[PDB]
Amino acid sequence: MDEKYVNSIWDLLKNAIQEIQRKNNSGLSFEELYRNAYTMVLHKHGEKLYTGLREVVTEHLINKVREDVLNSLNNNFLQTLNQAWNDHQTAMVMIRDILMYMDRVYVQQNNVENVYNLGLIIFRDQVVRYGCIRDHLRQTLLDMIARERKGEVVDRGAIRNACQMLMILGLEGRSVYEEDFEAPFLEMSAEFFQMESQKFLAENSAS
Amino acid sequence: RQINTEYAVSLLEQLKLFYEQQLFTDIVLIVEGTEFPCHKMVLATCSSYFRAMFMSGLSESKQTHVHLRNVDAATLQIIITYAYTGNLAMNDSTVEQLYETACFLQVEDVLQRCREYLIKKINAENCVRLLSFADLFSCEELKQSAKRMVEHKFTAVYHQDAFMQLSHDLLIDILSSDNLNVEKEETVREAAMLWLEYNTESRSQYLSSVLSQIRIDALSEVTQRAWFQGLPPNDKSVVVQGLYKSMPKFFKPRLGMTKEEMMIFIEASSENPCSLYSSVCYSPQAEKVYKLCSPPADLHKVGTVVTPDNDIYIAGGQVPLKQTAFRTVNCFYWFDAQQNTWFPKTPMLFVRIKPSLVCCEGYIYAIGGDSVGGELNRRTVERYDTEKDEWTMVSPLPCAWQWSAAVVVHDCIYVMTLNLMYCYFPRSDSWVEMAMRQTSRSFASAAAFGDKIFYIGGLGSSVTVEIYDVNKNEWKMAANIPAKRYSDPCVRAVVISNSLCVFMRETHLNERAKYVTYQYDLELDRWSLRQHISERVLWDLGRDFRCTVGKLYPSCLEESPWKP
Fold first, then answer.
1. Which of 3.40.250.10, 3.30.70.20, 3.30.710.10, 3.40.50.150 is the CATH number of B5-136?
2. From the list A25, A35, A90, which residue is nearest B58 (CB)?
3. What fold characterizes domain B260-559?
4. Which H or E run includes A152?
5. For residue B563, what are the CA distances in angstroms to B295, B520, B535?
6. Which residues, at least 6 apart from A207, have a Cβ–Cβ distance to it below 8 Å?
7. What Cα–Cα distance (Å) separates residue B350 from each residue in B320, B347, B392?
8. Residue numbers of B between 122 and 151 with CB closer than 8 Å to A
9. Max Cα–Cα distance, chain A, nearest Å
10. Chain B interface, mutation test: which of A41, A44, A97, most B Cβ atoms within 10 Å?
11. B561 φ, ψ (degrees, to nearest 5)
């Protein structure tokens, strides 16, 4: 039909997606937001919908989570990061559902990544691989793992949650998880074990 | 192990019972005022939309009255009953809205089922409609099947009313393709012209693109002033544009103008001893032997037919059952003139051995050929519908004949046997007695040239020729073919180049088979040497091989590599 109809449909769909991202999904009529997706992808306007989805997702990320992480980089940094990841995932549940109905035709025709993969990629680009969040996360994880190796006990389930989060963020395998976590960890463990062996060779014997 | 069939079906029927008898039915679908009480589990197990709708966290996870819009009542009902029992009633009309609602609800099973049904239903009178439908909803496999079938049927009819209402991209993909089947390059030109003149200013912007896909051999000639007549007034951005744009787009000949009259053979002697038989073809103009695809599952003892629309079909035959071993099957197939493959079609009702396939009034008539029933009506003659893709019985042959031939003259079926002949009237569905031959000969072939039947050979065979006239209703002798004595000639009557020629392979004592064709002079009653087939290109074919008149493309086919 006319451009005004599809523009209004996209506007109401964007409003509904933003309301869902505000954890106000509870009272939202799936039917009255999907009756707008079928009729959107039907008219061969999937490119505009995909571009608008990407823009809305990256804007919401940069506005909410990029500010929340930088605001709480010292007061439960990893806990707030895991909470933001869980919120993003639980919203990208219904988001990916709708836009997977969309994704069937779109990615089988346009040969692009799905909307779940799109959200994972934009999250990796805007939160984890940020110019400041990446180094801060690296430094704090190295510090806490070194303090754990020193002898005192710290939280351990949170590290497993973070490693699983990074593994899922890889989205293809163990490509990014390696560069972001393994490589820095390897250098620190190398220096630590070298110093430990140098201390042990002089303070004890082969017994 | 697998799944207990007992419970599998017990659960299925119990689920269906909970549906029809309103019981544990929780969510109810509200469609145009029609109630649809059902469950969430069954809907989630099939429709991806319903799976996404319930498993979410939206109000529909705790809702009951969803107002599903932009759907149909009967389509939703059949989808729900299929989700509850596995039964899909696919008629020939509601498959369109069925595919629509399936793509809306994203149900993969019914989508694949209706896609297969439409891949079977694709024919002439709905090719453009199915292509527009596969362009609306992304159905790339169906889109390609449409396009092809379309292409060909489009360039054979170009009179479809739905052709006018087509998207610009689809028209560009159709016209610019190298698979169009046209004996000339001017019919696509006038087709594009009429599609453009269907409107005016709504096609002006597409005028600059549609001419960019047709060759320049007609973009400098006529049908440029006819566009200037229909040109918008004072518009000086199209006239001079088409004036100084008729220079590149290097004119290249298409593929549709490569249909030469060829002699298609089947069940030829296989070159490699690993296979039983093969199919080859002779080129009366190119003087070569191009190979053809093997019959479907080495289908032996079959019959051929070439409709006036130049289409090859195969009916009847027997397949070696899984030493002598052969079982007869009633499978039917259609030959793709471009893809070089045999597409399966609706099989017959009864199995046949060497059936006489004859085309008439758009129907394919397989007259007799070892009927299985062998009851009091030991004929079971059948006609095939090329429009509805189904078989229909016709009036049975009055007498049971074996090793017979049949032709079509004057919109009637003429089946010939040892000495008797009966003409079938398709308008009245009856059989009328015809003239009687004075010689008892069998195992021969006949070619319909004009309004005369030429029963050549008969019994090896011989050089006896009995010409029959339809307007005169009499069998008369003309002459005998001059052949080498003490030989067994294998005669094959066929029509080619608007003349009655004969494909007669002869074999001498202690000598190999020699191939040579003769041109029978109709007014002089004499077989003249038209061309001598050199043995350097054509090897032995056998005895049970058939020959037919048809057109093929030398480009899509490949030359058979074999030593002289």
1. 3.30.710.10
2. A25
3. Neuraminidase (2.120.10)
4. none
5. 23, 32, 10
6. none
7. 18, 9, 12
8. 138, 140
9. 86
10. A97
11. -75, 110
